[PDB]
Amino acid sequence: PMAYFVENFWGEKNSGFDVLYHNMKHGQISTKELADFVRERATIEEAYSRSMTKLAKSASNYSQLGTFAPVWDVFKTSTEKLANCHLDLVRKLQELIKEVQKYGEEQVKSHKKTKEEVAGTLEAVQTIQSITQALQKSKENYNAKCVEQERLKKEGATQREIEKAAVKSKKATDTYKLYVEKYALAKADFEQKMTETAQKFQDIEETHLIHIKEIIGSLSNAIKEIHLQIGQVHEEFINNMANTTVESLIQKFAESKGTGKERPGLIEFEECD
Amino acid sequence: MAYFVENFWGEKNSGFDVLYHNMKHGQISTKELADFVRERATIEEAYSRSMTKLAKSASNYSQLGTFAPVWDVFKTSTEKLANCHLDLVRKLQELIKEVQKYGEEQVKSHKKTKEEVAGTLEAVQTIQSITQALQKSKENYNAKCVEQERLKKEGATQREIEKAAVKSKKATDTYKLYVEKYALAKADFEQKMTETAQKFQDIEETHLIHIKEIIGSLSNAIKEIHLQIGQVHEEFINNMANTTVESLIQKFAESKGTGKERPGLIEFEEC
């Protein structure tokens, strides 16, 4: 709840506004980088899915010879289901990329509106920066008339030409005195505007980081959901292997590849006929 | 029960030849199991090395933005995921070793079994040699009786009858001997085949139970890593919860803050 942005963005240069504003704009970078990360994760998931699909094809094309042969269909169906799980994660990640891209383009809208809203604080910054430089110029000019006043005074000059040098110091004093009052006015305006705007930026940054973590939340949800499905494919495979018993494998081999039930007949002595 | 004994006889008696070659096909099932685990490990390693590459790319994103520190959470979690899949690769490579060790010791027991029931192979060669010779003598003895009938219907000499009778007598003596030798070989084949077909089923039982034990070890290895993968997903969720909005706001403000102190007070200063 603490105002970190208000407390930490002042300094002598009055550049805090600039930093904060461009930091808001850098929030666009993060959205592009996140989408790119999810795209690459989806690439890996699809590579895995396509290879698993190919692994199921090779499982169906194994030799039909032997008692174990029918078990490859249990390998086929499970590998097909596992491959489909990963492809569905790809689809879910791709839907997630779409809503990151959607957030990225509504950032551009809300950044444009913030720019138009902080226009008063932009003025407050450039006026205080201008007056601080103008005050320094009037400070140095005031001192330049002091040195020239005392240069002519200590060396020896007419009281008429000293008095007109004193008036040149008076106008140098008055304008410097006026800039001191102008600084205090611009300083009070800047501090009032910056405190409202530094908080404004922090609030924008909090809304940003909340929405981003919600996307990573949906990222974690899709991965967890598919992870649960993957675990169910493994368990289905386990008990399908349990159901495929040795008894049934021998049963099916004898019934299909058995030569004959009836044993060779008994032949006796035959008459000539 | 006994399916191999009951259902492997037939007229041509291919029973032994089929069951022996089927035992040999048990070696193919072992090779194809190795090829499956190897291909699965290849997929699991490619995935792992891609994830490692993804984990390292997570750190090479922009330093700009309040979100920046969150990338380390991605980096550490994606690294751990990558290592889980490589650990499975190592476990699957240990299975390929025991499958091929089982495959090479199958060759040892199969050649032993061949030498154990070579007598039953002889019994198949014996009954086939005899039944053909029994049919040869059956056709012969009947032809001697056809000649006995042919020469009687036409009429011949009494001494030719003695010659045809003694030829039919020896045709009977051999044909009757082949009937006894068939019944002796049938009682030898059916006795040995029943013992051999039961032996072929018993060794096929020990084959199928051991192959299922290896696939059991396969399912265990995948289940164990799947549990670890689920823990990484939960650790990622936790680390994301720990990386609060407040901690990121504080991170950036103290890193890229322009100054704690507000613009200074400037008053008149006399020369």
Side-chain angles (χ1 to χ4, degrees), chain B residues 87-129:
Chain B
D87 199 27
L88 184 58
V89 175
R90 301 282 97 101
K91 287 190 186 297
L92 296 179
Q93 282 169 344
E94 284 299 294
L95 286 162
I96 303 158
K97 285 176 180 181
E98 73 159 37
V99 166
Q100 285 170 323
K101 195 177 182 175
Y102 167 78
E104 67 180 31
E105 75 176 332
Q106 265 195 310
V107 187
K108 289 183 179 179
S109 65
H110 282 205
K111 276 198 173 185
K112 189 191 177 179
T113 309
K114 182 195 178 72
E115 292 155 25
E116 276 183 331
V117 284
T120 318
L121 177 65
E122 281 192 304
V124 176
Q125 293 165 334
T126 304
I127 63 97
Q128 198 175 119
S129 178

mmCIF file of all heavy atoms in Angstrom, chain B residues 87-129:
data_model
loop_
_atom_site.group_PDB
_atom_site.id
_atom_site.type_symbol
_atom_site.label_atom_id
_atom_site.label_comp_id
_atom_site.label_asym_id
_atom_site.label_seq_id
_atom_site.Cartn_x
_atom_site.Cartn_y
_atom_site.Cartn_z
ATOM 1 N N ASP B 87 16.014 -36.591 -16.793
ATOM 2 C CA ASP B 87 16.126 -37.648 -15.791
ATOM 3 C C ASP B 87 15.342 -38.889 -16.216
ATOM 4 O O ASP B 87 15.752 -40.015 -15.929
ATOM 5 C CB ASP B 87 15.654 -37.156 -14.417
ATOM 6 C CG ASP B 87 16.168 -38.022 -13.273
ATOM 7 O OD1 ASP B 87 17.240 -38.653 -13.424
ATOM 8 O OD2 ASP B 87 15.502 -38.063 -12.215
ATOM 9 N N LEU B 88 14.221 -38.672 -16.905
ATOM 10 C CA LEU B 88 13.435 -39.760 -17.480
ATOM 11 C C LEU B 88 14.197 -40.423 -18.626
ATOM 12 O O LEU B 88 14.191 -41.646 -18.746
ATOM 13 C CB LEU B 88 12.063 -39.259 -17.954
ATOM 14 C CG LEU B 88 11.046 -40.267 -18.515
ATOM 15 C CD1 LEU B 88 10.708 -41.367 -17.515
ATOM 16 C CD2 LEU B 88 9.780 -39.555 -18.960
ATOM 17 N N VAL B 89 14.858 -39.610 -19.449
ATOM 18 C CA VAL B 89 15.701 -40.110 -20.538
ATOM 19 C C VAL B 89 16.745 -41.090 -20.000
ATOM 20 O O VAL B 89 16.936 -42.170 -20.561
ATOM 21 C CB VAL B 89 16.393 -38.952 -21.309
ATOM 22 C CG1 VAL B 89 17.372 -39.487 -22.354
ATOM 23 C CG2 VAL B 89 15.360 -38.065 -21.970
ATOM 24 N N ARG B 90 17.397 -40.708 -18.903
ATOM 25 C CA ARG B 90 18.402 -41.543 -18.247
ATOM 26 C C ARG B 90 17.801 -42.843 -17.706
ATOM 27 O O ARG B 90 18.452 -43.888 -17.735
ATOM 28 C CB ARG B 90 19.092 -40.773 -17.113
ATOM 29 C CG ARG B 90 19.799 -39.477 -17.521
ATOM 30 C CD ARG B 90 21.153 -39.725 -18.173
ATOM 31 N NE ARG B 90 21.076 -39.721 -19.635
ATOM 32 C CZ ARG B 90 21.429 -38.696 -20.410
ATOM 33 N NH1 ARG B 90 21.891 -37.571 -19.875
ATOM 34 N NH2 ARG B 90 21.322 -38.796 -21.729
ATOM 35 N N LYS B 91 16.564 -42.767 -17.216
ATOM 36 C CA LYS B 91 15.856 -43.934 -16.680
ATOM 37 C C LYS B 91 15.396 -44.881 -17.786
ATOM 38 O O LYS B 91 15.424 -46.101 -17.616
ATOM 39 C CB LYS B 91 14.663 -43.507 -15.816
ATOM 40 C CG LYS B 91 15.046 -42.917 -14.466
ATOM 41 C CD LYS B 91 13.828 -42.741 -13.567
ATOM 42 C CE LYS B 91 14.178 -42.005 -12.277
ATOM 43 N NZ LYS B 91 15.158 -42.738 -11.423
ATOM 44 N N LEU B 92 14.975 -44.310 -18.913
ATOM 45 C CA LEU B 92 14.575 -45.091 -20.081
ATOM 46 C C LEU B 92 15.775 -45.766 -20.741
ATOM 47 O O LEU B 92 15.652 -46.861 -21.286
ATOM 48 C CB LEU B 92 13.832 -44.219 -21.101
ATOM 49 C CG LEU B 92 12.490 -43.592 -20.701
ATOM 50 C CD1 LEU B 92 11.937 -42.758 -21.843
ATOM 51 C CD2 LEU B 92 11.477 -44.637 -20.269
ATOM 52 N N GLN B 93 16.931 -45.106 -20.685
ATOM 53 C CA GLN B 93 18.178 -45.667 -21.204
ATOM 54 C C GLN B 93 18.670 -46.832 -20.347
ATOM 55 O O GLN B 93 19.417 -47.686 -20.823
ATOM 56 C CB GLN B 93 19.255 -44.585 -21.320
ATOM 57 C CG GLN B 93 19.090 -43.685 -22.544
ATOM 58 C CD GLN B 93 19.992 -42.460 -22.520
ATOM 59 O OE1 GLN B 93 20.540 -42.091 -21.482
ATOM 60 N NE2 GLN B 93 20.141 -41.820 -23.675
ATOM 61 N N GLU B 94 18.246 -46.858 -19.086
ATOM 62 C CA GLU B 94 18.532 -47.977 -18.191
ATOM 63 C C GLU B 94 17.628 -49.172 -18.487
ATOM 64 O O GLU B 94 18.003 -50.318 -18.237
ATOM 65 C CB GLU B 94 18.399 -47.555 -16.723
ATOM 66 C CG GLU B 94 19.565 -46.719 -16.199
ATOM 67 C CD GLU B 94 20.895 -47.457 -16.257
ATOM 68 O OE1 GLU B 94 21.058 -48.460 -15.528
ATOM 69 O OE2 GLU B 94 21.777 -47.028 -17.031
ATOM 70 N N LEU B 95 16.437 -48.892 -19.014
ATOM 71 C CA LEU B 95 15.498 -49.935 -19.419
ATOM 72 C C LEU B 95 15.946 -50.620 -20.707
ATOM 73 O O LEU B 95 15.896 -51.844 -20.805
ATOM 74 C CB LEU B 95 14.084 -49.368 -19.581
ATOM 75 C CG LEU B 95 13.298 -49.026 -18.310
ATOM 76 C CD1 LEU B 95 12.141 -48.094 -18.638
ATOM 77 C CD2 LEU B 95 12.799 -50.283 -17.599
ATOM 78 N N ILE B 96 16.390 -49.826 -21.682
ATOM 79 C CA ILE B 96 16.925 -50.351 -22.946
ATOM 80 C C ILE B 96 18.056 -51.347 -22.674
ATOM 81 O O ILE B 96 18.219 -52.328 -23.402
ATOM 82 C CB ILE B 96 17.430 -49.216 -23.879
ATOM 83 C CG1 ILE B 96 16.310 -48.212 -24.166
ATOM 84 C CG2 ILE B 96 17.971 -49.780 -25.197
ATOM 85 C CD1 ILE B 96 16.798 -46.839 -24.606
ATOM 86 N N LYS B 97 18.815 -51.089 -21.613
ATOM 87 C CA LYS B 97 19.917 -51.958 -21.208
ATOM 88 C C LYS B 97 19.441 -53.313 -20.684
ATOM 89 O O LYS B 97 19.993 -54.348 -21.062
ATOM 90 C CB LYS B 97 20.817 -51.256 -20.184
ATOM 91 C CG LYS B 97 21.716 -50.192 -20.799
ATOM 92 C CD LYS B 97 22.533 -49.456 -19.750
ATOM 93 C CE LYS B 97 23.426 -48.406 -20.399
ATOM 94 N NZ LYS B 97 24.254 -47.675 -19.400
ATOM 95 N N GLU B 98 18.419 -53.307 -19.827
ATOM 96 C CA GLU B 98 17.889 -54.550 -19.255
ATOM 97 C C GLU B 98 16.993 -55.325 -20.230
ATOM 98 O O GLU B 98 16.850 -56.543 -20.107
ATOM 99 C CB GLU B 98 17.176 -54.301 -17.916
ATOM 100 C CG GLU B 98 15.816 -53.615 -18.013
ATOM 101 C CD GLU B 98 14.946 -53.850 -16.788
ATOM 102 O OE1 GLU B 98 15.484 -53.896 -15.660
ATOM 103 O OE2 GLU B 98 13.714 -53.984 -16.954
ATOM 104 N N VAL B 99 16.395 -54.614 -21.186
ATOM 105 C CA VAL B 99 15.601 -55.235 -22.252
ATOM 106 C C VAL B 99 16.514 -56.020 -23.194
ATOM 107 O O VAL B 99 16.214 -57.160 -23.551
ATOM 108 C CB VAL B 99 14.773 -54.182 -23.045
ATOM 109 C CG1 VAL B 99 14.235 -54.761 -24.350
ATOM 110 C CG2 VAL B 99 13.628 -53.656 -22.200
ATOM 111 N N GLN B 100 17.629 -55.404 -23.581
ATOM 112 C CA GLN B 100 18.617 -56.045 -24.446
ATOM 113 C C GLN B 100 19.434 -57.103 -23.702
ATOM 114 O O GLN B 100 19.994 -58.006 -24.325
ATOM 115 C CB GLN B 100 19.529 -55.001 -25.096
ATOM 116 C CG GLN B 100 18.865 -54.229 -26.236
ATOM 117 C CD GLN B 100 19.686 -53.042 -26.717
ATOM 118 O OE1 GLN B 100 20.339 -52.356 -25.928
ATOM 119 N NE2 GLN B 100 19.644 -52.789 -28.022
ATOM 120 N N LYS B 101 19.498 -56.986 -22.376
ATOM 121 C CA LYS B 101 20.122 -58.008 -21.536
ATOM 122 C C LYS B 101 19.193 -59.213 -21.398
ATOM 123 O O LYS B 101 19.652 -60.355 -21.314
ATOM 124 C CB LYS B 101 20.478 -57.445 -20.157
ATOM 125 C CG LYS B 101 21.446 -58.309 -19.361
ATOM 126 C CD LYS B 101 21.807 -57.664 -18.035
ATOM 127 C CE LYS B 101 22.821 -58.505 -17.274
ATOM 128 N NZ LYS B 101 23.277 -57.829 -16.027
ATOM 129 N N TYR B 102 17.888 -58.945 -21.370
ATOM 130 C CA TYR B 102 16.869 -59.993 -21.399
ATOM 131 C C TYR B 102 16.782 -60.614 -22.794
ATOM 132 O O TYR B 102 16.526 -61.810 -22.932
ATOM 133 C CB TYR B 102 15.509 -59.434 -20.960
ATOM 134 C CG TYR B 102 14.330 -60.341 -21.241
ATOM 135 C CD1 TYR B 102 14.055 -61.439 -20.425
ATOM 136 C CD2 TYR B 102 13.484 -60.098 -22.323
ATOM 137 C CE1 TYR B 102 12.970 -62.273 -20.683
ATOM 138 C CE2 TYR B 102 12.399 -60.926 -22.590
ATOM 139 C CZ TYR B 102 12.146 -62.010 -21.767
ATOM 140 O OH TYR B 102 11.071 -62.829 -22.029
ATOM 141 N N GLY B 103 16.999 -59.790 -23.816
ATOM 142 C CA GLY B 103 16.967 -60.233 -25.206
ATOM 143 C C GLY B 103 18.095 -61.182 -25.563
ATOM 144 O O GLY B 103 17.899 -62.122 -26.335
ATOM 145 N N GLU B 104 19.276 -60.938 -24.997
ATOM 146 C CA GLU B 104 20.453 -61.771 -25.267
ATOM 147 C C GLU B 104 20.473 -63.070 -24.454
ATOM 148 O O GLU B 104 21.097 -64.051 -24.865
ATOM 149 C CB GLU B 104 21.757 -60.977 -25.079
ATOM 150 C CG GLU B 104 22.066 -60.548 -23.643
ATOM 151 C CD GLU B 104 23.362 -59.757 -23.519
ATOM 152 O OE1 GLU B 104 23.731 -59.038 -24.475
ATOM 153 O OE2 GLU B 104 24.015 -59.856 -22.459
ATOM 154 N N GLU B 105 19.793 -63.069 -23.307
ATOM 155 C CA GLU B 105 19.660 -64.275 -22.485
ATOM 156 C C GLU B 105 18.465 -65.123 -22.928
ATOM 157 O O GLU B 105 18.332 -66.280 -22.521
ATOM 158 C CB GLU B 105 19.592 -63.937 -20.989
ATOM 159 C CG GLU B 105 18.268 -63.359 -20.503
ATOM 160 C CD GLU B 105 18.235 -63.131 -18.999
ATOM 161 O OE1 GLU B 105 18.948 -63.848 -18.263
ATOM 162 O OE2 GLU B 105 17.490 -62.233 -18.549
ATOM 163 N N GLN B 106 17.598 -64.534 -23.752
ATOM 164 C CA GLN B 106 16.544 -65.278 -24.433
ATOM 165 C C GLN B 106 17.149 -66.215 -25.473
ATOM 166 O O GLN B 106 16.722 -67.362 -25.599
ATOM 167 C CB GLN B 106 15.548 -64.334 -25.106
ATOM 168 C CG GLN B 106 14.315 -64.017 -24.274
ATOM 169 C CD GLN B 106 13.201 -63.391 -25.098
ATOM 170 O OE1 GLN B 106 13.420 -62.434 -25.842
ATOM 171 N NE2 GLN B 106 11.997 -63.932 -24.966
ATOM 172 N N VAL B 107 18.149 -65.721 -26.203
ATOM 173 C CA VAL B 107 18.876 -66.511 -27.202
ATOM 174 C C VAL B 107 19.522 -67.743 -26.561
ATOM 175 O O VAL B 107 19.593 -68.808 -27.178
ATOM 176 C CB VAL B 107 19.960 -65.665 -27.929
ATOM 177 C CG1 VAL B 107 20.584 -66.446 -29.083
ATOM 178 C CG2 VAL B 107 19.374 -64.353 -28.440
ATOM 179 N N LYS B 108 19.978 -67.582 -25.319
ATOM 180 C CA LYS B 108 20.600 -68.663 -24.555
ATOM 181 C C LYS B 108 19.611 -69.768 -24.181
ATOM 182 O O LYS B 108 19.903 -70.952 -24.366
ATOM 183 C CB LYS B 108 21.280 -68.113 -23.297
ATOM 184 C CG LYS B 108 22.539 -67.301 -23.565
ATOM 185 C CD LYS B 108 23.188 -66.852 -22.267
ATOM 186 C CE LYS B 108 24.455 -66.053 -22.529
ATOM 187 N NZ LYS B 108 25.081 -65.590 -21.260
ATOM 188 N N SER B 109 18.447 -69.378 -23.660
ATOM 189 C CA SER B 109 17.428 -70.336 -23.222
ATOM 190 C C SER B 109 16.668 -70.975 -24.388
ATOM 191 O O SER B 109 16.201 -72.110 -24.280
ATOM 192 C CB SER B 109 16.449 -69.681 -22.240
ATOM 193 O OG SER B 109 15.696 -68.658 -22.867
ATOM 194 N N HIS B 110 16.553 -70.241 -25.495
ATOM 195 C CA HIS B 110 15.871 -70.727 -26.696
ATOM 196 C C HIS B 110 16.639 -71.855 -27.382
ATOM 197 O O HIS B 110 16.039 -72.832 -27.834
ATOM 198 C CB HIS B 110 15.626 -69.577 -27.676
ATOM 199 C CG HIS B 110 14.464 -68.704 -27.310
ATOM 200 N ND1 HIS B 110 13.768 -67.966 -28.243
ATOM 201 C CD2 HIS B 110 13.869 -68.460 -26.118
ATOM 202 C CE1 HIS B 110 12.803 -67.295 -27.640
ATOM 203 N NE2 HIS B 110 12.840 -67.580 -26.350
ATOM 204 N N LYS B 111 17.960 -71.711 -27.457
ATOM 205 C CA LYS B 111 18.827 -72.757 -28.005
ATOM 206 C C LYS B 111 18.882 -73.982 -27.094
ATOM 207 O O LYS B 111 19.029 -75.109 -27.573
ATOM 208 C CB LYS B 111 20.238 -72.226 -28.263
ATOM 209 C CG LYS B 111 20.399 -71.524 -29.601
ATOM 210 C CD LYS B 111 21.864 -71.425 -29.992
ATOM 211 C CE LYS B 111 22.024 -70.880 -31.401
ATOM 212 N NZ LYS B 111 23.448 -70.893 -31.839
ATOM 213 N N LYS B 112 18.767 -73.751 -25.786
ATOM 214 C CA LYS B 112 18.704 -74.831 -24.805
ATOM 215 C C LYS B 112 17.399 -75.614 -24.951
ATOM 216 O O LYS B 112 17.402 -76.845 -24.880
ATOM 217 C CB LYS B 112 18.843 -74.283 -23.381
ATOM 218 C CG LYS B 112 19.015 -75.356 -22.313
ATOM 219 C CD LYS B 112 18.883 -74.780 -20.915
ATOM 220 C CE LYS B 112 18.986 -75.871 -19.861
ATOM 221 N NZ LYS B 112 18.872 -75.325 -18.481
ATOM 222 N N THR B 113 16.296 -74.894 -25.163
ATOM 223 C CA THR B 113 14.975 -75.504 -25.351
ATOM 224 C C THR B 113 14.927 -76.334 -26.638
ATOM 225 O O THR B 113 14.319 -77.405 -26.664
ATOM 226 C CB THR B 113 13.844 -74.441 -25.343
ATOM 227 O OG1 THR B 113 13.972 -73.613 -24.181
ATOM 228 C CG2 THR B 113 12.468 -75.099 -25.324
ATOM 229 N N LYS B 114 15.579 -75.837 -27.690
ATOM 230 C CA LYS B 114 15.704 -76.555 -28.961
ATOM 231 C C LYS B 114 16.342 -77.931 -28.759
ATOM 232 O O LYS B 114 15.862 -78.934 -29.295
ATOM 233 C CB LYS B 114 16.535 -75.728 -29.949
ATOM 234 C CG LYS B 114 16.695 -76.345 -31.334
ATOM 235 C CD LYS B 114 17.808 -75.654 -32.110
ATOM 236 C CE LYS B 114 18.020 -76.281 -33.479
ATOM 237 N NZ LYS B 114 16.917 -75.960 -34.427
ATOM 238 N N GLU B 115 17.417 -77.962 -27.975
ATOM 239 C CA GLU B 115 18.143 -79.193 -27.673
ATOM 240 C C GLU B 115 17.408 -80.063 -26.651
ATOM 241 O O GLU B 115 17.641 -81.272 -26.577
ATOM 242 C CB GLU B 115 19.554 -78.867 -27.175
ATOM 243 C CG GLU B 115 20.467 -78.273 -28.244
ATOM 244 C CD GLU B 115 21.595 -77.427 -27.671
ATOM 245 O OE1 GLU B 115 21.986 -77.647 -26.503
ATOM 246 O OE2 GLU B 115 22.091 -76.540 -28.397
ATOM 247 N N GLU B 116 16.526 -79.443 -25.868
ATOM 248 C CA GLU B 116 15.730 -80.160 -24.870
ATOM 249 C C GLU B 116 14.603 -80.978 -25.501
ATOM 250 O O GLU B 116 14.283 -82.067 -25.021
ATOM 251 C CB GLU B 116 15.164 -79.198 -23.820
ATOM 252 C CG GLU B 116 16.128 -78.878 -22.678
ATOM 253 C CD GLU B 116 15.517 -77.978 -21.612
ATOM 254 O OE1 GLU B 116 14.623 -77.167 -21.938
ATOM 255 O OE2 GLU B 116 15.940 -78.078 -20.441
ATOM 256 N N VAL B 117 14.003 -80.450 -26.567
ATOM 257 C CA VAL B 117 12.927 -81.157 -27.271
ATOM 258 C C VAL B 117 13.241 -81.397 -28.754
ATOM 259 O O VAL B 117 12.477 -81.006 -29.644
ATOM 260 C CB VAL B 117 11.530 -80.484 -27.077
ATOM 261 C CG1 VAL B 117 10.978 -80.790 -25.688
ATOM 262 C CG2 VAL B 117 11.590 -78.976 -27.324
ATOM 263 N N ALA B 118 14.374 -82.048 -29.000
ATOM 264 C CA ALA B 118 14.756 -82.473 -30.344
ATOM 265 C C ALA B 118 14.130 -83.827 -30.674
ATOM 266 O O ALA B 118 13.961 -84.174 -31.846
ATOM 267 C CB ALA B 118 16.271 -82.537 -30.470
ATOM 268 N N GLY B 119 13.787 -84.581 -29.629
ATOM 269 C CA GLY B 119 13.138 -85.884 -29.768
ATOM 270 C C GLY B 119 11.714 -85.787 -30.284
ATOM 271 O O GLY B 119 11.236 -86.688 -30.979
ATOM 272 N N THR B 120 11.041 -84.691 -29.938
ATOM 273 C CA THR B 120 9.686 -84.415 -30.413
ATOM 274 C C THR B 120 9.706 -83.999 -31.886
ATOM 275 O O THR B 120 8.752 -84.257 -32.623
ATOM 276 C CB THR B 120 8.996 -83.328 -29.561
ATOM 277 O OG1 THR B 120 9.286 -83.550 -28.175
ATOM 278 C CG2 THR B 120 7.483 -83.352 -29.766
ATOM 279 N N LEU B 121 10.796 -83.355 -32.302
ATOM 280 C CA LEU B 121 11.021 -83.023 -33.708
ATOM 281 C C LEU B 121 11.216 -84.298 -34.528
ATOM 282 O O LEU B 121 10.721 -84.402 -35.654
ATOM 283 C CB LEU B 121 12.231 -82.090 -33.860
ATOM 284 C CG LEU B 121 12.697 -81.676 -35.263
ATOM 285 C CD1 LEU B 121 11.656 -80.825 -35.990
ATOM 286 C CD2 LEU B 121 14.030 -80.945 -35.184
ATOM 287 N N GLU B 122 11.935 -85.260 -33.948
ATOM 288 C CA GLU B 122 12.127 -86.575 -34.557
ATOM 289 C C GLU B 122 10.808 -87.332 -34.671
ATOM 290 O O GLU B 122 10.559 -87.999 -35.675
ATOM 291 C CB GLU B 122 13.140 -87.405 -33.763
ATOM 292 C CG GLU B 122 14.593 -87.038 -34.028
ATOM 293 C CD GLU B 122 15.569 -88.056 -33.462
ATOM 294 O OE1 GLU B 122 15.517 -88.330 -32.243
ATOM 295 O OE2 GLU B 122 16.395 -88.578 -34.241
ATOM 296 N N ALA B 123 9.970 -87.209 -33.642
ATOM 297 C CA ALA B 123 8.655 -87.852 -33.606
ATOM 298 C C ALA B 123 7.720 -87.359 -34.714
ATOM 299 O O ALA B 123 6.871 -88.111 -35.190
ATOM 300 C CB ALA B 123 8.010 -87.665 -32.239
ATOM 301 N N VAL B 124 7.881 -86.096 -35.113
ATOM 302 C CA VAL B 124 7.117 -85.519 -36.224
ATOM 303 C C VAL B 124 7.651 -86.045 -37.558
ATOM 304 O O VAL B 124 6.881 -86.316 -38.483
ATOM 305 C CB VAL B 124 7.138 -83.964 -36.195
ATOM 306 C CG1 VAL B 124 6.415 -83.375 -37.406
ATOM 307 C CG2 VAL B 124 6.509 -83.443 -34.908
ATOM 308 N N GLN B 125 8.972 -86.192 -37.641
ATOM 309 C CA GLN B 125 9.630 -86.750 -38.825
ATOM 310 C C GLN B 125 9.362 -88.249 -38.956
ATOM 311 O O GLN B 125 9.291 -88.775 -40.068
ATOM 312 C CB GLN B 125 11.139 -86.492 -38.774
ATOM 313 C CG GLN B 125 11.534 -85.021 -38.886
ATOM 314 C CD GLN B 125 12.978 -84.759 -38.480
ATOM 315 O OE1 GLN B 125 13.564 -85.504 -37.692
ATOM 316 N NE2 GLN B 125 13.554 -83.689 -39.014
ATOM 317 N N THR B 126 9.212 -88.920 -37.814
ATOM 318 C CA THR B 126 8.961 -90.361 -37.763
ATOM 319 C C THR B 126 7.559 -90.710 -38.265
ATOM 320 O O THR B 126 7.414 -91.537 -39.169
ATOM 321 C CB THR B 126 9.181 -90.931 -36.335
ATOM 322 O OG1 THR B 126 10.506 -90.614 -35.890
ATOM 323 C CG2 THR B 126 9.003 -92.443 -36.312
ATOM 324 N N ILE B 127 6.538 -90.073 -37.688
ATOM 325 C CA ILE B 127 5.142 -90.348 -38.058
ATOM 326 C C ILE B 127 4.817 -89.961 -39.503
ATOM 327 O O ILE B 127 3.951 -90.571 -40.129
ATOM 328 C CB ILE B 127 4.107 -89.714 -37.068
ATOM 329 C CG1 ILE B 127 4.193 -88.182 -37.041
ATOM 330 C CG2 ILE B 127 4.268 -90.292 -35.669
ATOM 331 C CD1 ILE B 127 3.173 -87.480 -37.927
ATOM 332 N N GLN B 128 5.516 -88.954 -40.021
ATOM 333 C CA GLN B 128 5.340 -88.521 -41.405
ATOM 334 C C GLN B 128 6.029 -89.491 -42.365
ATOM 335 O O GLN B 128 5.546 -89.722 -43.474
ATOM 336 C CB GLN B 128 5.872 -87.098 -41.597
ATOM 337 C CG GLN B 128 5.358 -86.401 -42.854
ATOM 338 C CD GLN B 128 5.806 -84.953 -42.953
ATOM 339 O OE1 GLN B 128 6.502 -84.572 -43.894
ATOM 340 N NE2 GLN B 128 5.409 -84.138 -41.979
ATOM 341 N N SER B 129 7.155 -90.053 -41.926
ATOM 342 C CA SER B 129 7.886 -91.056 -42.700
ATOM 343 C C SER B 129 7.131 -92.383 -42.742
ATOM 344 O O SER B 129 7.135 -93.074 -43.764
ATOM 345 C CB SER B 129 9.286 -91.267 -42.120
ATOM 346 O OG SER B 129 9.997 -92.262 -42.837
#
